[PDB]
Amino acid sequence: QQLYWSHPRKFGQGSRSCRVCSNRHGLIRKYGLNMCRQCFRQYAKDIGFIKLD
Amino acid sequence: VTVKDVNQQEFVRALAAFLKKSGKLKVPEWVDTVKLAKHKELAPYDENWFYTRAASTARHLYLRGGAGVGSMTKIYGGRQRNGVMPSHFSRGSKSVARRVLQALEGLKMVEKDQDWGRKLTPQGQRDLDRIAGQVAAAKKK
Amino acid sequence: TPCGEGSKTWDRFQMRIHKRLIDLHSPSEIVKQITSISIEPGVEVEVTIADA
Amino acid sequence: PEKFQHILRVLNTNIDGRRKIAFAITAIKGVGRRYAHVVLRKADIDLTKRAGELTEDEVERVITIMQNPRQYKIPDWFLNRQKDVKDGKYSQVLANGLDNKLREDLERLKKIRAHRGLRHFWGLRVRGQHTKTTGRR
Amino acid sequence: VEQKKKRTFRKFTYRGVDLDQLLDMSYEQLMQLYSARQRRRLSRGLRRKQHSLLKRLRKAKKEAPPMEKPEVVKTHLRDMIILPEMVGSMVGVYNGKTFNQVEIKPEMIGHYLGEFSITYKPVKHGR
Amino acid sequence: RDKLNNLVLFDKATYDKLCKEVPNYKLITPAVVSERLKIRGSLARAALQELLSKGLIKLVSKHRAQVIYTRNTKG
Amino acid sequence: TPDIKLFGKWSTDDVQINDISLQDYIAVKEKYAKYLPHSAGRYAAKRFRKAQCPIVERLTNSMMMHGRNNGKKLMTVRIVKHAFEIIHLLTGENPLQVLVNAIINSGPREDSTRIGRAGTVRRQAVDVSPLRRVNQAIWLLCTGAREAAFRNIKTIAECLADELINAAKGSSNSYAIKKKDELERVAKSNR
RNA sequence: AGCCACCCGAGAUUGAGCAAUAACAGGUCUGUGAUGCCCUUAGAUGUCGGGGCUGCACGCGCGCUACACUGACUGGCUCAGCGUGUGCCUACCCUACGCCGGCAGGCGCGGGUAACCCGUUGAACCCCAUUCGUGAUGGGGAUCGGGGAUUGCAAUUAUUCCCCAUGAACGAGGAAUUCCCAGUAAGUGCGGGUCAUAAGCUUGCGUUGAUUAAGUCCCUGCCCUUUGUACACACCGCCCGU
């Protein structure tokens, strides 16, 4: 008997999350990545990012 | 010559006086109580400076292929005091800069031309050169 | 560092995308045809009708 | 090397050479540096001079323009209180009369029991910003 | 217990509009005049999806005589700006854990409900 | 630190003093004149600008921040 | 110009070094004459390099100290050029000759280095290198000029000029002289 | 083996990336539909409405803004670089250019997934002619009052921005203590990240640019032999008597 169970969000960090988990703070929205930094560390190999400097 | 060969400070002052002789500068109903830019902590000393700015703008446009409000605002702009936060660049009053561009256009010092905004008029090219000659004899610094 | 105590350690990854263009002038199809064949993986190649 | 003109009154303070005219005036409340500078420009008085220079004439001309600001084209935005809360106009408030209104507004919002009023009265910081380890020593 | 000449002596303008004129304008004509915080709320809100709350205000004002205040009408919102329609009601203004009951008098108009309810002590350390 | 002020009124006696003390100087700046008299520093400066239309003082700098005057040609 | 390279409105000629022990760290024409001082803006590249830098250039560099005034050479060059003019009016002469004399008179001879002696406060009398004597002198004089200017009407240019002239022939109104007399006196004493 | 100087000159003078053997109950179950056991689970600890993290008699740390004249003020001169952008898989751009407004801001166009357009990135420091005159002064912008706007459906407990007024301590910092050898310290702006709105943050970048060791093991830390040890959970250990 649902009547409300969503509320509009498009505001702050609370309107988005990682695409494998739910997380807040440090969400990379640049380049359409949409992953939290902690997850991005483990997948930084798979995107093609590399450290030389 | 280009205007750059002669003394730049003397050029703008000489041109500013030449503008006063013309007898019109299509002056604002502001500039007697103004904040002006937000880089200012004190209201302008006089209402004289409008001529000086106009001369400066005319010179700046002479250099370029055509430009409008944006170019003038950055040059006149400086450091903006943000209170107790770090001082940073900004761009101040746009009403005055726009008004100056309109007023110069009215006298036909500068006119709309290609590459957007106003570029110099041959009437202005002649005027600038005459004061350039006076300046050229005076010094070079 | 996950969970920030210790020292300030920062990691910076770069990714260097490289672009080049080449403007060929010669007739219609036989250009884009002879070029785009003989390659399949791993380097994007775009042939554009742009430029008159 | 002209003495001669000295000792001018703006409102309840003695104004003498010390600084440029504009700055000299700002002893009184309700006249900041910008206010006094713009009043002088309106009143056609060179503001680079001293307040031990200039006669009584110039002072009165300044006083009339400050206390009738609209009627001499000092705009409404430039005013300390715009539309006010007591008075339906737009008033420049000067001297001791600013202190009056400040008191009024604080009492006012203690009655009405508005957040600004209550915080100020109790000694808590009216702005919502940190006072965690600040607002003291 | 409602409207002007009654719980007021500070009077004059709130902000540009005298309480006389205010109380006999509608909120429509109020936001047009001198009102900037209120004006943003009403324009962007656009009657502001607090519908039922506002109707509960009118309801208990109606059913109570105009000689006395309502039966008290609670709300969870406290971002509500007092509009002349409301005035004379008695509003339970939630604080997320307490409803402070506040009669809305003619001096409160243009101010927020929230400013008359507290989440905060006078602050002590044994003081 | 410190507290030091000068007369900020343009006076009679100090202008006269200045012009009649003139062989003492060979270096003249606003600050010097200010110290040696009680004239302001600002109105030190201005007194010099007046003085230069006797030409008992000659310009040898004209810098924005502060100016340097000589007394006569070289003294 | 190639015959003699002058300063930018003063001469490099008639500058005499009035000491035989301070030679080869005082120069202005022994190759090192410049209209405008600036080498390349490094002086810490070699230990050799210090000899290259003349006393005039070293004095401009040492001046820019205390956070706001740091890293503004252009301001200092303008102040210094003004300072030379102030010296010239006050004593005639050549301002560079006044500068050289000031360095020689302000430079210490003996100083002290720490030496252990029971844990009591004693020190060993030692002579110091002429490079050190020049370096310390220039420091003292710049710090003196800045110190005066801070809460007084006079500008850095004026105070620097006053500081050099007083040191050039003693007056006991120069900071550098007063400090030097303390260092040499203490040196003589000790253990 | 190597060391020192000298020539050429980027000099045997750049900065990152890089980690062994092994230790640590360092931090993390709140990055993880990695996970053991436990709790709770339709009566939720699985979702919406509201408030607090933002409360201050006081202690601490990283900072920021300051204490001025290489500056406050009013005109004017004038040179950049690393990077970035819309038309995106849960939400969206940079703006030249026209007009209006002191300002905040409002409004019309057009180009550009881009060394095409923003951006000849004509930035700040700097340079210059004044004013002010070292005076808590106009240095400083604290606190407060009134008003305008921008962001959001919602700003109350200022989200932020602007306009005016009100115009604090602080005029160089004790006990103590950090960092630094060259485009370095210090001054100074800029771009990106967080993001509906919101930087005093951090990551890079160019600009202006020193004084000073030019060495050594004194203190401190770490690493070499030797020696001593009642130590071995290893001296923040042990270890005695009243």
mmCIF file with all atom_site columns, C-alpha atoms in Angstrom, chain G residues 111-180:
data_model
loop_
_atom_site.group_PDB
_atom_site.id
_atom_site.type_symbol
_atom_site.label_atom_id
_atom_site.label_alt_id
_atom_site.label_comp_id
_atom_site.label_asym_id
_atom_site.label_entity_id
_atom_site.label_seq_id
_atom_site.pdbx_PDB_ins_code
_atom_site.Cartn_x
_atom_site.Cartn_y
_atom_site.Cartn_z
_atom_site.occupancy
_atom_site.B_iso_or_equiv
_atom_site.pdbx_formal_charge
_atom_site.auth_seq_id
_atom_site.auth_comp_id
_atom_site.auth_asym_id
_atom_site.auth_atom_id
_atom_site.pdbx_PDB_model_num
ATOM 1  C CA . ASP G 1 111 ? 84.391 38.169 16.710 1.00 0.00 ? 111 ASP G CA 1
ATOM 2  C CA . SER G 1 112 ? 83.754 35.073 18.801 1.00 0.00 ? 112 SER G CA 1
ATOM 3  C CA . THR G 1 113 ? 82.952 31.428 18.169 1.00 0.00 ? 113 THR G CA 1
ATOM 4  C CA . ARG G 1 114 ? 81.642 29.089 20.894 1.00 0.00 ? 114 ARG G CA 1
ATOM 5  C CA . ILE G 1 115 ? 84.144 26.991 22.849 1.00 0.00 ? 115 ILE G CA 1
ATOM 6  C CA . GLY G 1 116 ? 83.486 24.735 25.831 1.00 0.00 ? 116 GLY G CA 1
ATOM 7  C CA . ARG G 1 117 ? 84.941 25.777 29.166 1.00 0.00 ? 117 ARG G CA 1
ATOM 8  C CA . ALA G 1 118 ? 83.265 24.091 32.129 1.00 0.00 ? 118 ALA G CA 1
ATOM 9  C CA . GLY G 1 119 ? 79.774 24.780 30.781 1.00 0.00 ? 119 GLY G CA 1
ATOM 10 C CA . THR G 1 120 ? 80.328 28.414 31.821 1.00 0.00 ? 120 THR G CA 1
ATOM 11 C CA . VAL G 1 121 ? 79.699 31.139 29.251 1.00 0.00 ? 121 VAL G CA 1
ATOM 12 C CA . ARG G 1 122 ? 83.061 31.678 27.585 1.00 0.00 ? 122 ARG G CA 1
ATOM 13 C CA . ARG G 1 123 ? 83.989 31.864 23.921 1.00 0.00 ? 123 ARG G CA 1
ATOM 14 C CA . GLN G 1 124 ? 87.148 31.770 21.803 1.00 0.00 ? 124 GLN G CA 1
ATOM 15 C CA . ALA G 1 125 ? 88.482 34.953 20.228 1.00 0.00 ? 125 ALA G CA 1
ATOM 16 C CA . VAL G 1 126 ? 88.748 34.390 16.496 1.00 0.00 ? 126 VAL G CA 1
ATOM 17 C CA . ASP G 1 127 ? 89.308 36.510 13.414 1.00 0.00 ? 127 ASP G CA 1
ATOM 18 C CA . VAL G 1 128 ? 86.726 36.128 10.660 1.00 0.00 ? 128 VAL G CA 1
ATOM 19 C CA . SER G 1 129 ? 87.111 35.918 6.881  1.00 0.00 ? 129 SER G CA 1
ATOM 20 C CA . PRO G 1 130 ? 86.803 39.171 4.808  1.00 0.00 ? 130 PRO G CA 1
ATOM 21 C CA . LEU G 1 131 ? 83.905 37.522 2.911  1.00 0.00 ? 131 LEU G CA 1
ATOM 22 C CA . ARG G 1 132 ? 82.097 37.160 6.253  1.00 0.00 ? 132 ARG G CA 1
ATOM 23 C CA . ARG G 1 133 ? 82.981 40.788 7.187  1.00 0.00 ? 133 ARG G CA 1
ATOM 24 C CA . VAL G 1 134 ? 81.425 42.087 3.940  1.00 0.00 ? 134 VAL G CA 1
ATOM 25 C CA . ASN G 1 135 ? 78.373 39.763 4.221  1.00 0.00 ? 135 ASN G CA 1
ATOM 26 C CA . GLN G 1 136 ? 77.653 40.791 7.843  1.00 0.00 ? 136 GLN G CA 1
ATOM 27 C CA . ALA G 1 137 ? 78.220 44.518 7.094  1.00 0.00 ? 137 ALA G CA 1
ATOM 28 C CA . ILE G 1 138 ? 75.678 44.531 4.221  1.00 0.00 ? 138 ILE G CA 1
ATOM 29 C CA . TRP G 1 139 ? 73.191 42.656 6.461  1.00 0.00 ? 139 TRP G CA 1
ATOM 30 C CA . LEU G 1 140 ? 73.548 45.154 9.355  1.00 0.00 ? 140 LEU G CA 1
ATOM 31 C CA . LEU G 1 141 ? 73.121 48.219 7.103  1.00 0.00 ? 141 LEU G CA 1
ATOM 32 C CA . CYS G 1 142 ? 69.988 46.924 5.282  1.00 0.00 ? 142 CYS G CA 1
ATOM 33 C CA . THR G 1 143 ? 68.362 45.856 8.579  1.00 0.00 ? 143 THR G CA 1
ATOM 34 C CA . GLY G 1 144 ? 69.179 49.303 10.028 1.00 0.00 ? 144 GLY G CA 1
ATOM 35 C CA . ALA G 1 145 ? 67.483 51.161 7.172  1.00 0.00 ? 145 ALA G CA 1
ATOM 36 C CA . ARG G 1 146 ? 64.349 48.975 7.318  1.00 0.00 ? 146 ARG G CA 1
ATOM 37 C CA . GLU G 1 147 ? 64.109 49.214 11.130 1.00 0.00 ? 147 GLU G CA 1
ATOM 38 C CA . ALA G 1 148 ? 64.077 53.030 11.075 1.00 0.00 ? 148 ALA G CA 1
ATOM 39 C CA . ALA G 1 149 ? 61.514 53.298 8.241  1.00 0.00 ? 149 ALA G CA 1
ATOM 40 C CA . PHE G 1 150 ? 58.928 51.048 9.910  1.00 0.00 ? 150 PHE G CA 1
ATOM 41 C CA . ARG G 1 151 ? 57.358 53.491 12.390 1.00 0.00 ? 151 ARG G CA 1
ATOM 42 C CA . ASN G 1 152 ? 58.802 56.747 11.062 1.00 0.00 ? 152 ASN G CA 1
ATOM 43 C CA . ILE G 1 153 ? 57.945 59.097 8.193  1.00 0.00 ? 153 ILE G CA 1
ATOM 44 C CA . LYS G 1 154 ? 61.229 58.461 6.354  1.00 0.00 ? 154 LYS G CA 1
ATOM 45 C CA . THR G 1 155 ? 61.289 55.878 3.580  1.00 0.00 ? 155 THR G CA 1
ATOM 46 C CA . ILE G 1 156 ? 63.774 53.009 3.113  1.00 0.00 ? 156 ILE G CA 1
ATOM 47 C CA . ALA G 1 157 ? 65.788 55.072 0.572  1.00 0.00 ? 157 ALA G CA 1
ATOM 48 C CA . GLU G 1 158 ? 66.334 57.968 3.011  1.00 0.00 ? 158 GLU G CA 1
ATOM 49 C CA . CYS G 1 159 ? 67.148 55.758 5.992  1.00 0.00 ? 159 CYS G CA 1
ATOM 50 C CA . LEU G 1 160 ? 69.627 53.694 3.928  1.00 0.00 ? 160 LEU G CA 1
ATOM 51 C CA . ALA G 1 161 ? 71.360 56.905 2.819  1.00 0.00 ? 161 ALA G CA 1
ATOM 52 C CA . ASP G 1 162 ? 71.581 58.149 6.428  1.00 0.00 ? 162 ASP G CA 1
ATOM 53 C CA . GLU G 1 163 ? 72.864 54.730 7.578  1.00 0.00 ? 163 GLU G CA 1
ATOM 54 C CA . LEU G 1 164 ? 75.692 54.656 5.003  1.00 0.00 ? 164 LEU G CA 1
ATOM 55 C CA . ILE G 1 165 ? 76.894 58.242 5.638  1.00 0.00 ? 165 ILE G CA 1
ATOM 56 C CA . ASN G 1 166 ? 76.990 57.838 9.445  1.00 0.00 ? 166 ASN G CA 1
ATOM 57 C CA . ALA G 1 167 ? 79.008 54.619 9.076  1.00 0.00 ? 167 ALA G CA 1
ATOM 58 C CA . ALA G 1 168 ? 81.297 56.095 6.368  1.00 0.00 ? 168 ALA G CA 1
ATOM 59 C CA . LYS G 1 169 ? 82.787 58.512 8.844  1.00 0.00 ? 169 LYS G CA 1
ATOM 60 C CA . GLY G 1 170 ? 81.676 57.626 12.379 1.00 0.00 ? 170 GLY G CA 1
ATOM 61 C CA . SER G 1 171 ? 78.848 59.476 14.090 1.00 0.00 ? 171 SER G CA 1
ATOM 62 C CA . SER G 1 172 ? 77.539 56.772 16.462 1.00 0.00 ? 172 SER G CA 1
ATOM 63 C CA . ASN G 1 173 ? 74.064 57.055 14.951 1.00 0.00 ? 173 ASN G CA 1
ATOM 64 C CA . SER G 1 174 ? 74.554 54.024 12.699 1.00 0.00 ? 174 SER G CA 1
ATOM 65 C CA . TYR G 1 175 ? 73.347 50.612 13.858 1.00 0.00 ? 175 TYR G CA 1
ATOM 66 C CA . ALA G 1 176 ? 76.132 48.736 12.052 1.00 0.00 ? 176 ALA G CA 1
ATOM 67 C CA . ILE G 1 177 ? 78.909 50.665 13.876 1.00 0.00 ? 177 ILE G CA 1
ATOM 68 C CA . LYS G 1 178 ? 77.217 50.167 17.274 1.00 0.00 ? 178 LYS G CA 1
ATOM 69 C CA . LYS G 1 179 ? 76.877 46.401 16.740 1.00 0.00 ? 179 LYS G CA 1
ATOM 70 C CA . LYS G 1 180 ? 80.474 46.037 15.476 1.00 0.00 ? 180 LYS G CA 1
#
